[PDB]
Scaffold this active site. Structure first.
Site, mmCIF file in Angstrom:
data_model
loop_
_atom_site.group_PDB
_atom_site.id
_atom_site.type_symbol
_atom_site.label_atom_id
_atom_site.label_comp_id
_atom_site.label_asym_id
_atom_site.label_seq_id
_atom_site.Cartn_x
_atom_site.Cartn_y
_atom_site.Cartn_z
ATOM 1 N N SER A 1 -46.760 25.950 -22.103
ATOM 2 C CA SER A 1 -45.731 27.012 -21.949
ATOM 3 C C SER A 1 -45.941 27.730 -20.614
ATOM 4 C CB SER A 1 -45.785 27.982 -23.099
ATOM 5 O OG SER A 1 -45.445 29.293 -22.675
ATOM 6 N N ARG A 2 -45.562 27.081 -19.507
ATOM 7 C CA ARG A 2 -45.704 27.662 -18.145
ATOM 8 C C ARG A 2 -44.524 28.601 -17.863
ATOM 9 N NH1 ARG A 2 -50.917 26.559 -18.207
ATOM 10 N NH2 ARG A 2 -51.347 24.313 -18.272
ATOM 11 N N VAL A 3 -44.496 29.751 -18.542
ATOM 12 C CA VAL A 3 -43.414 30.767 -18.379
ATOM 13 C C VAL A 3 -43.778 31.983 -19.239
ATOM 14 C CG1 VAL A 3 -41.061 31.291 -19.166
ATOM 15 C CG2 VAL A 3 -41.452 29.330 -17.662
#
Lengths: 52, 140, 277, 177, 156, 140, 140, 52, 52
Positions: free
Chosen positions: B6-8
């Site tokens: 989950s790069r956000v």
């Protein structure tokens, strides 16, 4: 999916009664990701495996 | 946990959880490295053997029942109670009953400071380490 | 491409039968070699309470023995005592001594000359083909006393259980060349015994050390043989498991390629029909 | 005289300072035996521990009160606190008494130690007991052993061992109860 | 699959090519080091089936030297990125080209058969593999006394 | 080298290269088939192992840097120097310098008559039999 | 025999064949399970080797030649001579002749009452045990 | 697969059939040799998953 | 591959409880009593939960 759903969605519990359907499931080419069992299994609530 | 990414949300996590679950995902990484090679029963290196039943405790701490969500403050204390070794030497079939013991016995004013600061302040982890030592863990 | 996967599936499905077969075969050999090992374990005890156990002796000539396997599908057993025999040859060699290296098992001659080529002088093999006896171990012992050393070091894997194989080093000293010298404790520790031999104490100690070397060589290559069988039974059960997992991934990928094949030729038939009709 | 204290206690030292640390110190056969020779006790009165051994069998681990061993200077008997003796045995019968009952094995020859704690260790190669020997093929073998005198000393020694084994196996097969 | 091994950037070294990989363009030792790394990686890719189904313990000695050097150069090809330092926590490591050639020549010749595999994982160059080696072998010796509390009843 | 076919056969081959090519094909055919067992380098068999390292000499021989085609005379001399066993002393990994040493250290008058004669004549196969021994090969 | 199914043959075969074919198809169910396992014949358990030898007897028993179909009573007594005793000494190479010998040398009045009665009555069973021991088998 | 063993003609022995392989037509002592050859080669093909 | 007495006594109890579970899942059927004689038994849910 729509033909199988139009069949299998009439097998429910209403307020007046219920239909419970026991369906023999054939798996083509022993492949459980083939679209006929993979679409049929989305409707099944129990499996009853009769083994030899 | 290896694939789930989950790069956000990284810049979007609870700052109390961001500092205690940075330790959680890395220790689960080593538990993913040990149990993926040492399944043969070859040898116990007695330090990789430590992180096998540490990572088994973090796994059982991360189980959850259905239709029972937890507030984020009662989550990051249960992650604080496990990665800081307060839940150590509790048997792995007790941690579902043991992390319920942690949230039930810790003073509910702890979670009110942690929700409002959003952060385990230096005045609180010294206090929250104290309230975890006064915890009737099951099995002793 | 979609046929070579069907042959790879049959190959891996057959490997998962062959390894399961020889896992059962190694189990049947292990369960009846353990019987001989725990009966052979008795006779080594009177010598190690009569002669003691002195590994760190000042021998000026040594014969090390690495007792390995013949069949080489054992799983890190033979190289374990290769590491141990290069650790014990880097424990006694600090004074300028002669060392002879021999090995029992073909996996010893193929892994000892890689670590050390000049001191290796003899290769005993084909031991475990019929069975292992005491006449055979004593013949190996006589061919070891064709050299004249002051010590003998045996390296073998001892069958503690079906899981643990502790690598044991076993030591024998030449009789009055080193055995009488290592017993002198302000006098001697062997003078308490009354020799009832036909000849003097040096001759009965020569015969005793030959008999001790024979029984520790017999027990060493029994323990290593059945621990070889146990590590093969455990090493072909991590092998059939991985060959079942590889077969499962191959069957899933073959089914994906099968479905994609039927859709691909169907779409080409439909495109060719719509290009006309 | 005692200027090299070797041993598993001290091999650990020179090994740990000179072998790579991924290997623990290898085991030794003294780690698997519980009963030593010079240590205290294991007599307690009349019955002492007798350990009868062959390479292929263990025939007695039980406590016996007297053992009759066939040494090369004659059949001797081992009572409880017997003097420590490394005794070479010739072909003869080993009698392990406990009372009224006793076990008589004919052995092939091989040493028998008595230790300063009273532990007796009979260590033979082939212990063929008396009710499984045949009395017919012994004469068929010692006939050739009496007849054959070769030119070489090696088969001479083999024939002398043959006749001293077969002749002793004669004397202990007719005079059995 | 290289990304699932944790090796990031997940570049397949046996499927990525260049027209600059030519001894007349980049030099002789660069091209030779690159071809040596690709030879080690191909020789390891050819050993994947028997390592999977028979185990690591049944190769030859040169084969299991090749396997160890290949597992070293697989980890060493990974690198922390300066644009990934916000979701990884590692600082980014710009490696010079000469540093890459020197470090991979060191792993290829055999100067670094002594370090662990994870010494090579996510580092800049051949100095940082040794720094990470002492950083992870002081870690197995990292056991301090008395827990260093200074928290028990802090006064006001 | 297995799947590569030429259905003109050796009917369209340089003579002399034909005298070495059937041998080179045959030893490469042996080296291919006794491989898929070369992973187990433990058991020295001394009949297969000679075939394996000889085929390794031949396989290392046919490596070639690009944009520099070799004249056919130097090619058949470099294959003759490997199929007659002159390179059995040199290791596997250092033949591409050994073949260059062979090519640049023999007399350049060997090729001037190998090209003209068309085949390896009996007045020439014992000239270079001695010429291939009076050069030094980079390998012991 | 493992992949060929008949979903009728439950109570649709010859009763004298049904007395024996259940044992024949359950003995072959063990042989197909252990066959590809013990391809080698070296180190074998005394239960697995017995069903291997029995399956190898039945396998050579079932094969027959072309354009010569067998009457049902004769194959009934051939599978009776195979799944009972009476054939556990011929190796594998002679069962092709041994079933022909037990067909020809047996007093052929057992076939007529086997065909007319349809099943193996215990009187015919006892004459079939007696008639099958006096057959000179060509195992030599 | 017969060809990269170098065997020429690369005729598969276990795939080449003829209607002239009756014992009635070519006689029994030829047919038995051919059937024995095919049996031996098929059992070798079975053993190749061990002896390779 | 090893033997019945190889494993522990709690494994003996796991074998015994599972073998009497495998038999207790069996049931005589009321429709099959015409060709098996013995009468069939409709087991309620409150009985099979308690029995197991």
């Amino acid at each position: 999916a729509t033909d199988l759903g139009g069949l299998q969605e009439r097998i429910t519990t209403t307020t007046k009664g219920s239909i419970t359907s026991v369906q023999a499931v054939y798996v083509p080419a022993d492949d459980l990701t083939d679209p006929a069992p993979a679409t049929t299994f989305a409707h099944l609530d129990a499996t009853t495996v009769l083994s030899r | 946990v290896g694939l789930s990414v989950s790069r956000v949300g990284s810049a979007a996590q609870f700052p109390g959880m961001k500092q205690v679950a940075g330790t959680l995902k890395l220790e689960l990484a080593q538990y993913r490295e040990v149990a993926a090679f040492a399944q043969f029963g070859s040898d116990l290196d007695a330090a990789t053997q430590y992180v096998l039943e540490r990572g088994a405790r973090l796994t059982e701490m991360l189980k959850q029942k259905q239709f029972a969500p937890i507030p984020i403050e009662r989550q990051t204390v249960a992650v604080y109670a496990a990665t800081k070794g307060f839940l150590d030497k509790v048997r792995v079939q007790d941690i579902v009953a043991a992390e319920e013991a942690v949230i039930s016995q810790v003073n509910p004013a702890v979670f009110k400071i942690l929700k409002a600061n959003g952060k385990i302040t230096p005045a609180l982890d010294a206090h929250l380490k104290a309230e975890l030592r006064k915890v009737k863990l099951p099995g002793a | 491409s979609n046929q070579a996967v069907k042959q790879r599936i049959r190959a891996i499905k057959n490997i998962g039968k062959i390894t399961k077969a020889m896992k059962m075969v190694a189990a049947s050999k292990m369960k009846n070699a353990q019987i001989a090992v725990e009966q052979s374990r008795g006779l080594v005890d009177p010598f190690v309470r009569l002669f003691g156990d002195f590994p760190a002796v000042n021998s000026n000539k040594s014969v090390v023995v690495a007792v390995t396997s013949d069949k080489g599908l054992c799983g890190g057993l033979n190289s374990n005592i290769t590491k141990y025999t290069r650790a014990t040859l880097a424990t006694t060699e600090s004074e300028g001594k002669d060392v002879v290296v021999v090995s029992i098992g073909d996996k010893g001659r193929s892994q000892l000359t890689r670590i050390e080529s000049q001191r290796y002088q003899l290769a005993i093999a084909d031991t475990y083909k019929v069975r292992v006896t005491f006449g055979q171990a004593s013949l190996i012992v006589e061919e070891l006393i064709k050299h004249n050393p002051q010590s003998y070091q045996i390296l073998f894997n001892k069958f503690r259980s079906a899981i643990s194989f502790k690598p044991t080093v076993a030591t024998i000293l030449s009789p009055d060349l080193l055995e009488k010298q290592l017993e002198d404790v302000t006098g001697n520790s062997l003078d308490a015994y009354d020799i009832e031999a036909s000849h003097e104490r040096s001759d009965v100690l020569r015969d005793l050390t030959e008999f001790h070397l024979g029984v520790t060589l017999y027990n060493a290559m029994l323990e290593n043989n059945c621990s070889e069988h146990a590590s093969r039974m455990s090493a072909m059960e991590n092998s059939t498991k991985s060959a079942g997992e590889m077969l499962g991934k191959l069957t899933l990928d073959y089914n994906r390629k099968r479905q994609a094949t039927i859709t691909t030729e169907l779409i080409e038939i439909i495109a060719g029909a719509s290009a006309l009709m | 005289e005692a200027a090299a204290p070797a041993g598993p206690k001290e091999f650990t030292e020179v090994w740990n300072k000179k072998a790579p640390s991924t290997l623990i110190v290898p085991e030794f056969p003294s780690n698997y035996t519980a009963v030593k020779a010079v240590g205290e006790g294991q007599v307690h009165g009349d019955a002492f521990p007798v350990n009868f051994y062959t390479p292929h069998s263990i025939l007695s681990q039980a406590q016996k009160d007297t053992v009759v061993l066939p040494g090369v200077d004659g059949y001797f008997g081992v009572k409880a606190s017997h003097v420590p003796t490394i005794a070479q045995l010739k072909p003869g019968v080993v009698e392990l008494h406990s009372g009224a009952e006793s076990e008589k094995f004919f052995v092939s020859g091989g040493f028998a130690f008595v230790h300063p704690n009273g532990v007796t260790d009979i260590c033979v190669l082939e212990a063929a007991t008396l009710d499984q020997v045949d009395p017919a093929a012994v004469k068929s073998a010692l006939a050739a052993a009496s007849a054959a005198q070769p030119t070489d000393e090696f088969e001479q020694a083999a024939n002398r061992a043959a006749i001293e084994l077969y002749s002793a196996l004669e004397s202990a097969v007719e005079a059995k109860a | 699959s290289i990304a699932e091994l944790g090796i990031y950037p997940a570049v397949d070294p046996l499927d990525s090519t260049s027209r600059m990989l030519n001894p007349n363009v980049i030099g002789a030792e660069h091209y030779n080091v690159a071809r040596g790394v690709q030879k080690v990686l191909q020789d390891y890719k050819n050993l994947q089936d028997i390592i999977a189904i028979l185990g690591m313990d049944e190769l030859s000695e040169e084969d299991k030297l090749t396997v160890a050097r290949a597992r070293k150069i697989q980890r060493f090809l990974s690198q922390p990125f300066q644009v990934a330092e916000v979701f990884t926590g590692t600082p980014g490591k710009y490696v010079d080209l000469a540093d890459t050639i020197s470090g991979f020549q060191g792993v290829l010749t055999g100067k670094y058969d002594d370090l662990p595999e994870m010494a090579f994982y996510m580092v800049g160059d051949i100095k940082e593999v040794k720094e990470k080696a002492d950083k992870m072998a002081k870690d197995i010796a990292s056991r301090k006394e008395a827990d260093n509390k200074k928290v028990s009843e802090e006064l006001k």
